Symmetry: C3
């Protein structure tokens, strides 16, 4: 296991052993508290965060690491992302100096940088997250980039294994309405990871909301929500803005009929309800559904500490 | 008392005597229990500003060798929707109902600061928010100032009065003072609550209309004449608060600068010490001269916030499963 | 020199030789003194933005096994009233006079960053604020950049020049450069102050009207012809600063892009290295090509900020009561 970064499911290697370490740590949280002694983790945020912000610090502490959270934009200087521009305006520092500089004071870097929805190529080529990998001079892990969110998916995996009633459950990812255009990072990431399992994976969303093929893989895509839900064992709801052609980053619908309510859950095999959070109640899911005992939203969130501890541990183990 | 499950009111601290004992024990030997909280994580959550609580609590946690995570919800996280059963099709991204449980997932103890909102007296006085953390965080919760109390502060105030008192049962007078904005009655309520728990001679003095909730006032003497209350006092605890009674909940009834604690009033005291929880608006709450006088123990007071916090944190730790 | 009570100017570091010695000692063995600062708490206070100082200082403190509390006053705390004897019946909730002492209550060492306000030259140059922390914090105070100096930076600059110099006494040229906003002369002042303390050949080059305070310029050669100053330089330290003399204090006299350090000027140097404290506005202060060239040691420089901080912090620790 030579983890040099953590941005996609490939980086975690064999899911079996990965899950093994996961539950090992769930059972004995501070087992490796000495592993990261005198090792410093730098968490950088370009966007808001409750779970990632908190869960990652806890994870680092579980490994006895030093933690430095940097909310660039608030305490530091707004960065100029484009190269070859005359910085005679708004920005004081260029990303080109910033990244290297930040790498100077830590051993591992965590970066959260939501898709900007300004240019699909820029977003999907994951320019920013890649520059940290290229010039930080340190191992970099994603706290959600423009197109993936491995730390989240990994946790989702852990919780499904943790709660599944059979070896290969039917896991259905469903779109839901949201008032703002959200990245497809979570959906992309979830699919990517589910496709890596032997689960029966199905993706259901409205017309026009198809995700990038490379992520969809060969998962069944059902345009009829009620159909996809039939006999599901797990429902993973999440909204995302359009991706195809002329609608990149746009809201094509706010059809409240997709709001995961009791109507749809009923058709499932008494499936559990999952969501990465934050969640807008009575938009993505009904108060009753999320409050029902089938909702494992919290246990899920909880596992974020685990996924992070494992990834952090791996990265540490491979530090020079 | 040694079964601390939370810390929101004076009842939670148990026997004042032993509590004060631990306090001075730690004042003397600050890191005596530095190993107690090893690998134990404290989560401090702020919904409002803070200098003293923000700083003093982190130091306290470190004194116990704990891990500290300060979260300024609203800045780094997502604004929460507090009301239940609403359609979150607007401003907010996350609901308090998910937020609290989630936060509990990553720590062992939680500290919350949530000022009274002055929107609905019942909501504030039923301490809905602070209680939901207690109900759904799944962790021991301590108040960094709720809507109606501020135990961490009062406890420190107690420690400092004991620390400086010249006699066994001093006359401690709490006095209202003018302020340009409507402030919570959390500090006053809390102070009374704690003073009433002592054998001190406690007196509360404020303008007409500013009476505090009876359950807090207890049976403390209420003097509407400031100069009278001040007579022969040993300690003066000044603090402003907005009206509470009936139609004026959360409102400024007066900004009478005559109540500003100046030399005029101190003179009538028994050379009393001056106290205030801070922040303090100079020449509004108290005169520059008074606060700068040697009778002002404002800082030593503030300093004790580290102590009160260390003790509470220690107790909470000791009772962690 | 070995009894550090504060760190605001080059005098505080003592003998440069031994100072540099410790510097490289730590560069080689980063956590050598990780036990030195155990159970010692550092409080970093920011009144202005910061990437390098904010990060480098926390790392430094960790290298010494210290506790770190970063406080972004203004965001999490209460805006302070700086002027004394005012009636705080407005905007501010807390006065600097209470704030400083209070903050000192919870730490062992304090780091403060407070940019020059450019409102009154005397106020800025008398370094009123940074001095009040020294006067009333009750703790050793070190500058994270005050109104007129930035020792932590200069010390690092020194370390990197020694680290890269090709001869015993290189020609180090500090050059002004255009900037759209009026910047403090703290970095330039500080750089000169430290260079003047070395046996290097030091030259300062800037446009007419931008002369720095004499006490800082010392007896360094001042060349108004940029191209002349650059001739055969071994190190180029670029940095913008607003006017200082008489009627133009804190003002932009020029934005002459001819001073932008580009290849044109570097060519005339002795293949000199390029330095800058950062942040840097590309194609304003320096050309993309210049800063990206291999002669640019901008990052190695920034990196040394961790070292300068670790040394200063170590010294301060060693002299704690
Ligand atoms: C972790 C989720 C972050 C974000 N959600 C929102 C609502 O901003 C997203 O969809 O990527
Ligand atoms: C610690 C005091 C906090 C607050 N003060 C202000 C000014 O908001 C209050 O009166 O509750
Ligand atoms: C490192 C200090 C940077 C600062 N510059 C700005 C942009 O305010 C200054 O000139 O002091």
């Amino acid at each position: 296991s030579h983890m040099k970064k953590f941005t996609c499911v490939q980086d975690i290697g064999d899911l079996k052993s990965a899950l093994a370490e996961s539950f090992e740590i769930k059972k004995d949280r501070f087992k490796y508290v000495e592993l990261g002694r005198n090792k410093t983790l730098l968490m950088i945020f370009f966007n808001s965060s409750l779970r990632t912000r908190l869960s990652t610090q806890k994870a680092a502490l579980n490994l006895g690491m030093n933690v430095i959270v940097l909310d660039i934009n608030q305490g530091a200087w707004k960065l100029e992302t484009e190269r070859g521009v005359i910085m005679d305006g708004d920005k004081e520092e260029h990303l080109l100096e910033a990244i290297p500089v930040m790498g100077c004071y830590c051993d591992i870097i965590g970066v959260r940088s939501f898709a900007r929805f300004e240019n699909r190529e820029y977003d999907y080529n994951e320019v920013i997250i890649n520059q940290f990998i290229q010039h930080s001079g340190r191992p970099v892990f994603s706290m959600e980039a423009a197109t993936r969110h491995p730390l989240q998916s990994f946790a989702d995996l852990i919780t499904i294994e943790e709660y599944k009633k059979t070896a290969r459950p039917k896991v259905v990812m469903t779109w839901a309405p949201h008032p703002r255009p959200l990245p497809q990072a979570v959906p992309n990431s979830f699919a990517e990871w589910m496709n890596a399992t032997d689960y029966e994976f199905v993706i259901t969303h409205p017309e026009g909301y198809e995700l990038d093929p490379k992520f969809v893989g060969n998962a069944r895509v059902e345009y009829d929500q009620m159909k996809a839900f039939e006999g599901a064992d797990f429902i993973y709801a999440k909204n995302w803005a359009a991706y195809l052609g002329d609608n990149y980053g746009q809201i094509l619908s706010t059809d409240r009929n997709w709001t995961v309510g009791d109507r749809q859950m009923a058709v499932t095999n008494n499936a559990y309800f999952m969501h990465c959070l934050p969640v807008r109640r009575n938009m993505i899911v009904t108060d009753d559904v999320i409050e029902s005992p089938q909702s494992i939203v919290i246990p899920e969130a909880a596992n974020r500490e685990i996924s992070a501890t494992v990834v952090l541990k791996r990265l540490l183990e491979n530090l020079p």
